Write a structure and sequence with these properties.
The structure is cut from a larger assembly and holds three copies of chain A, one copy of chain D (about 120 residues) and one copy of chain E (about 100 residues). Helices cover about 0% and strands about 40% of the residues of chain A. By secondary structure, chain A is mainly beta. In chain A, β3 and β4 form a beta hairpin. With about 120 residues, chain D is mostly beta strands. The N and C termini of chain D lie far apart (about 35 Å). In chain D, strands 3, 4, 5, 8, 9 and 10 form a six-stranded antiparallel sheet that branches. A four-stranded antiparallel sheet of chain D has the order 1-2-7-6, with no helix packed on it. Chain D is globular. Chain D has a single domain, classed as Immunoglobulin-like, CATH 2.60.40. Chain E has a single domain, classed as Immunoglobulins (Immunoglobulin-like), CATH 2.60.40.10. Chain E is about 0% helix and about 40% strand. Chain E has no helices and nine strands. In chain E, strands 1, 3, 4, 7, 8 and 9 form a six-stranded mixed sheet that branches. In chain E, strands 2-6-5 form a three-stranded antiparallel sheet, with no helix packed on it. Classes of the chains: A mainly beta (about 50), D mainly beta (about 120), E mainly beta (about 100). At the D-E interface, β4 of D face β3, β4, β7 and β8 of E. β1 of chain B pairs antiparallel with β23 of chain C, so a sheet runs across the interface. The complex binds a molecule of 2 linked components (NAG-NAG) and 2-acetamido-2-deoxy-beta-D-glucopyranose (5 copies). The site of one 2-acetamido-2-deoxy-beta-D-glucopyranose (NAG) has 2 residues of chain B, from loops. It is classed as viral protein. The entry lists the keywords antibody, viral protein. CryoEM structure of del68-76/del679-688 prefusion-stabilized spike in complex with the Fab of N12-9.
Chain lengths: ~50, ~30, ~475, ~120, ~100
C-alpha cells in the first residue's frame, strides 16, 4: 500500500525484480501484475507553508 | 583500529589493539 | 543401469584461487548508486576452491555445507547437472537437475542414484546433432512430488550458487565467455537468480553429472571406453560473511568488498566506501572469550533421613499407616531412583531426574504395607475397599509412589480397614508389599528441602565463566 | 559378464514355460537384455527387448501378447514368459546384452554379451 | 523391415572377403555385423558400421552408406569360415538379415 503518482520509468528492471526500493524502507518503483509494466512511484507534491 | 595510507596509495595496513598486551593474538611492536 | 567407473583414481585434491567470485544478488530489491552492506552466505574472496576435472572422472559426492559455488569451463556441454541430496539413496528424497540441449528438468524423487551417475552421449550418423543422451544416474525413481521444466540453465565459463534456505532451493547463475587460459578469471561478475524451487528437503551432499562418450567396447566390462571430454569444474563453499556491494546507477553489482577478509576490507565496510582516506579508523572490538565454566556451591551438609522408612525394622499396617514429615535437608532422589530394589516407581508431574534442581517447602512420607493386588489403588480418583475405607488419594496433584514386594520380611499381624487380616503365607499377588508415598509441599513456606549441587574444580589466571554460590 | 540360459524343455503346443538367464557379476544392471531364437536351421531373428531400468518393453510382432519379459536386478537375472505356444516357437533361445540403457541408445551398440542358449522344443 | 544378404560367399584363404546387406534407405541406420560359427553362440564383429569391439582384429573392415552395408575381411584365413548376419534397428524392432555364409576353401 501507499500514496503517490505513478509514472512511466526508464529503469531497466531485470526479469526477476518485482519492485525497486529507495533508502529508509520506501518503495520507489514496482512492476504491475497482468501487464508486467514498470511504474515509478513519486510522492505527491508537498511542502511547508 | 586500522592504520591506512589510503586506497589511493597502497593497500598496506597496520592494526592497533588499543589496550592489550602482546601475548594474545608480520612484526609485532608493543 | 548403473555402471561404476571409479576404479582406483585417488589423487589428492588441488586448489585454485577464486579471486573475487561468487557474488550474487542477495536480494530482490533495486538499488541506486549506493554502497549497501549485506550480511549473507557468500564465498569469501581469495579462497581456495577445489579443482576437479572432466577427465580423471572426478565426480565425488561432496558436502553441501551451507550452499556451494559451482564454476565450470566446458567449451562443450559436458556438465549436465547435479544430484543434491542427503543420502542419495532410497528412503530419502533427493534433488536432480539435468538439462539436455533445449530443456532443463528438475525432479525431487526418492532416487536410487548410482555410485558414478552420468549421462552417455551419442551422435547418430544420419543427423550429427541430437547428442542422444542416455541416463546412467539412477536405477529407480518413484514416488515424488516436484517436477519443474524450463529452458536449460546452460570458453563459456558458467557459475552457479546453490543454497538451501528455509524450504527453498535458490539457484543463482552467470554464464560468461572467457578467454583466460585455465583458471577462474579476475573480472568481477555478479550472479543473478534463476529460480527459487519450494523443494523443502534436507540437502547435505551433492555430486555433478557428467557426459561421457563411448570410445570403444570390450565385450564384458561396461566400463571400457568412457572418455570424459575435456573440462573442469570448481566447488567452493559459502560462508556467512558481510559484503559491501557497490550497486550501479542501474542496479548492477559492479564491485564488492569482503568485510571479514582482512582489516582493509573491514574498514571499507565500516566506513561504507570503496576508498578510504589516510587516517586511523576504529572498526571493531577485541574480546577474549571464556574457555570453561566453574560452578561451585556450599559444602555438603546434613542428608535427608532417607535413613529410616524403607528400612523400618517393622512397617505399620495400612489401617494405621504412618505419615512422617521431612524438612530442612538435602534430598538425593538419584540414589533411590537408580536403585533396582523398587518393584514400582510412578511419579506424577516431574521426571525423577529433575528433582535435583527443583525445590520444595516440605515433604511427607506415607508408609504402609499393602498387597500387590491393592497397589493399583494408589492413584487419583480410584475406587475400591482401600480407596474408600482406607488411605484415599486426592483428585489433584500427586507426588511419587514407591512400592516393592516384601515377602521375605513380612510373610496375621497386618490388617486392613470391618477389619480383616492378610493371609501372608511364605510360599504372587498375595505376598506383602511395602508402599511409600512421597507428597510434596511446594508453597507452604520458604524452600528448605532441595537437591544438592555438583561442584567443579577451579581454574585460575584464565578468563572463565563462574558461578559462586549463586553469584 | 557371463550369462547362462535355462528352463527350456519339451512342451506341447499351447502350453507354457519360463526361460531363465543368470548373470556373472553385478554389471548386469548396466545391460539392456534381448532374447533371440534360433530355429533349428534358420538365422537370428529377434524376439524382444527390455531396458536397464526395465521401463521399455518391446516384443516382436510374431510374439506380441504371448510373452512378458521381466527383469530383476537384485536377483540379477532375466526372465521370459512362455504362453499359448506356436509350434514354430521351437528354437534355441539366446539372452543377449546390448549395453545401451534406454530406447534411444539401442541403435548405438551391438548385442555383445551372449549366454549359451537353451533349446525349446514344441511338439505334440 | 528387411535385410537382404547373399546366401553364400566363397573365398580362398589368404584372399579378400566381401559381404553386403541391402534393403530400404539403409545408410540412415547403424548396422551391426555378427559372426556365428556352426554349433557356437555368435560373436560381434562390427557395430555402428565402423566400430570393432576390443579384441576384434583390424581385418574386419566395414562401412555403411546408401542402400547397402558392407563387410570386408582382408587377409582371409582358416579361422574365418562362419555365418555372418546383418543387423539393424527399425523403430525399436531389431531386424536380422538372412545371413551370408563363409567357405574358406
Ligand atoms: C535405610 O537405611 C540404609 C542406610 O541408612 C539405606 O540403604 C541404602 O539403600 C540404597 C538404595 O537401596 C543403596 O543404594 C545404598 O547402597 C544403601 N546403603 C548402603 C550403605 O549400602 C536405605 O536407603 C535406608 N532407607 C532410608 C529411607 O533412608
Ligand atoms: C519405501 C517406502 O517407504 N514407500 C512408501 C510407503 O512406505 C508408503 O506407505 C506409501 C504411501 O504413500 O508411499 C511409499
Ligand atoms: C540505458 C543504458 O544502457 N544505460 C547504461 C549504459 O549507458 C552503460 O554504458 C552501461 C554500462 O556502463 O550500463 C547501462
Ligand atoms: C487480467 O484479467 C483481465 C480481466 O479482468 C484482462 O482484461 C487482462 O487482459 C488480464 N491480463 C493478463 C491475462 O495478462
Ligand atoms: C586518487 O588521487 C588522484 C590524484 O591524487 C585523483 O586524481 C583520483 O581521483 C583519486 N582517486 C579516487 C578519488 O578514487
Ligand atoms: C606485558 O606482559 C609481560 C609478560 O607477559 C609483562 O612482563 C609486561 O610488563 C606487560 N606489559 C605491560 C604490563 O605494560
Amino acid at each position: 500500500t501507499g500514496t503517490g503518482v505513478l509514472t512511466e520509468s526508464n529503469k531497466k528492471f531485470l526479469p526477476f525484480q518485482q519492485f525497486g526500493r529507495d533508502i529508509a524502507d520506501t518503495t520507489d518503483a514496482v512492476r504491475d501484475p497482468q501487464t508486467l509494466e514498470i511504474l515509478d512511484i513519486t510522492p505527491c507534491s508537498f511542502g511547508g507553508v | 583500529s586500522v592504520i591506512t595510507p589510503g586506497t589511493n596509495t597502497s593497500n598496506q595496513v597496520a592494526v592497533l589493539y588499543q589496550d592489550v598486551n602482546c601475548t594474545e593474538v608480520s612484526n609485532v611492536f608493543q | 543401469q548403473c555402471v561404476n567407473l571409479t576404479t582406483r583414481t585417488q589423487l589428492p585434491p588441488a586448489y585454485t584461487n577464486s579471486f573475487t567470485r561468487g557474488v550474487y544478488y542477495p536480494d530482490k530489491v533495486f538499488r541506486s548508486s549506493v554502497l549497501h552492506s549485506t550480511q549473507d552466505l557468500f564465498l569469501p574472496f581469495f579462497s581456495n576452491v577445489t579443482w576437479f576435472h572432466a577427465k580423471r572422472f572426478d565426480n565425488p559426492v561432496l558436502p553441501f555445507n551451507d550452499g556451494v559455488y559451482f564454476a565450470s569451463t566446458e567449451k562443450s556441454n559436458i556438465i549436465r547437472g547435479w544430484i543434491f541430496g542427503t543420502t542419495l539413496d532410497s528412503k530419502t528424497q533427493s534433488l536432480l537437475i539435468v538439462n539436455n540441449a533445449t530443456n532443463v528438468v528438475i525432479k525431487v524423487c526418492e532416487f536410487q542414484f548410482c555410485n558414478d551417475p552420468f549421462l552417455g552421449v551419442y551422435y547418430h550418423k544420419n543427423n550429427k546433432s541430437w547428442m542422444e543422451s542416455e541416463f546412467r544416474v539412477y536405477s529407480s525413481a518413484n514416488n515424488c512430488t516436484f517436477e519443474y521444466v524450463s529452458q536449460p540453465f546452460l570458453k563459456n565459463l558458467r557459475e552457479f550458487v546453490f543454497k538451501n534456505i528455509d524450504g527453498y532451493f535458490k539457484i543463482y547463475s552467470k554464464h560468461t565467455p572467457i578467454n583466460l587460459v585455465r583458471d577462474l578469471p579476475q573480472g568481477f561478475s555478479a550472479l543473478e537468480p534463476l529460480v527459487d524451487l519450494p523443494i523443502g528437503i534436507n540437502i547435505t551432499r551433492f555430486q555433478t553429472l557428467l557426459a561421457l562418450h563411448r570410445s570403444y567396447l570390450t565385450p564384458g566390462d561396461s566400463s571400457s571406453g568412457w572418455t570424459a571430454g575435456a573440462a573442469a569444474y570448481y566447488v567452493g563453499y559459502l560462508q556467512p560473511r558481510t559484503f559491501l556491494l557497490k550497486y550501479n546507477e542501474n542496479g548492477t553489482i559492479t564491485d564488492a568488498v569482503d568485510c571479514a577478509l582482512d582489516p582493509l576490507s573491514e574498514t571499507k565496510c565500516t566506513l561504507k566506501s570503496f576508498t578510504v582516506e589516510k587516517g586511523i579508523y576504529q572498526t571493531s572490538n577485541f574480546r577474549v572469550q571464556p574457555t570453561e565454566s566453574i560452578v561451585r556451591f556450599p559444602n555438603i551438609t546434613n542428608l535427608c533421613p532417607f535413613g529410616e522408612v524403607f528400612n523400618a525394622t517393622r512397617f505399620a499396617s495400612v489401617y494405621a499407616w504412618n505419615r512422617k514429615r521431612i524438612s530442612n535437608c538435602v534430598a538425593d532422589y538419584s540414589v533411590l531412583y537408580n536403585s533396582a530394589s523398587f518393584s514400582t516407581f510412578k511419579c506424577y508431574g516431574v521426571s525423577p531426574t529433575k528433582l535435583n534442581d527443583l525445590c520444595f517447602t516440605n515433604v511427607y512420607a506415607d508408609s504402609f504395607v499393602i498387597r500387590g493386588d491393592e497397589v493399583r489403588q494408589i492413584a487419583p480418583g480410584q475406587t475400591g475397599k482401600i480407596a474408600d475405607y482406607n488411605y484415599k488419594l486426592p483428585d489433584d496433584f500427586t507426588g511419587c509412589v514407591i512400592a516393592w514386594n516384601s515377602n521375605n520380611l513380612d510373610s496375621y499381624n497386618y490388617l486392613y480397614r470391618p477389619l480383616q487380616s492378610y493371609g501372608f503365607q511364605p510360599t504372587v499377588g498375595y505376598q506383602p508389599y511395602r508402599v511409600v508415598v512421597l507428597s510434596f509441599e511446594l508453597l507452604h513456606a520458604p524452600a528448605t528441602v532441595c537437591g544438592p549441587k555438583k561442584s567443579t574444580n577451579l581454574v585460575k589466571n584464565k578468563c572463565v565463566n563462574f558461578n559462586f554460590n549463586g553469584l | 559378464v557371463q550369462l547362462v540360459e535355462s528352463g527350456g524343455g519339451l512342451v506341447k503346443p499351447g502350453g507354457s514355460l519360463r526361460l531363465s538367464c543368470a548373470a556373472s557379476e553385478f554389471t548386469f544392471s548396466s545391460y539392456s537384455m534381448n532374447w533371440v531364437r534360433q530355429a533349428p536351421g534358420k538365422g537370428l531373428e529377434w524376439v524382444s527387448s527390455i531396458s536397464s531400468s526395465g521401463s521399455q518393453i518391446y516384443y516382436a510382432d510374431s510374439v506380441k501378447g504371448r510373452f512378458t519379459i521381466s527383469r530383476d536386478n537384485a536377483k540379477k537375472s532375466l526372465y521370459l514368459q512362455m504362453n499359448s505356444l506356436r509350434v514354430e516357437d521351437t528354437a534355441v533361445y539366446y539372452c543377449a546384452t546390448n549395453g545401451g540403457a534406454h530406447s534411444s541408445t539401442w541403435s548405438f551398440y551391438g548385442m555383445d554379451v551372449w549366454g549359451q542358449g537353451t533349446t525349446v522344443t514344441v511338439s505334440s | 523391415y528387411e535385410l537382404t544378404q547373399p546366401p553364400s560367399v566363397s573365398v580362398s584363404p589368404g584372399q579378400t572377403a566381401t559381404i553386403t546387406c541391402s534393403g530400404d534407405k539403409l545408410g540412415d541406420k547403424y548396422a551391426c555385423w555378427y559372426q556365428q560359427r556352426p554349433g557356437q553362440s555368435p560373436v560381434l564383429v562390427i557395430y555402428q558400421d565402423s566400430k570393432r569391439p576390443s579384441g576384434i582384429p583390424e581385418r574386419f573392415s566395414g562401412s555403411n552408406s546408401g542402400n547397402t552395408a558392407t563387410l570386408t575381411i582382408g587377409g582371409t584365413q582358416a579361422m574365418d569360415e562362419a555365418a555372418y548376419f546383418c543387423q539393424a534397428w527399425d523403430s525399436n524392432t531389431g531386424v536380422f538379415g538372412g545371413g551370408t555364409k563363409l567357405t574358406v576353401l
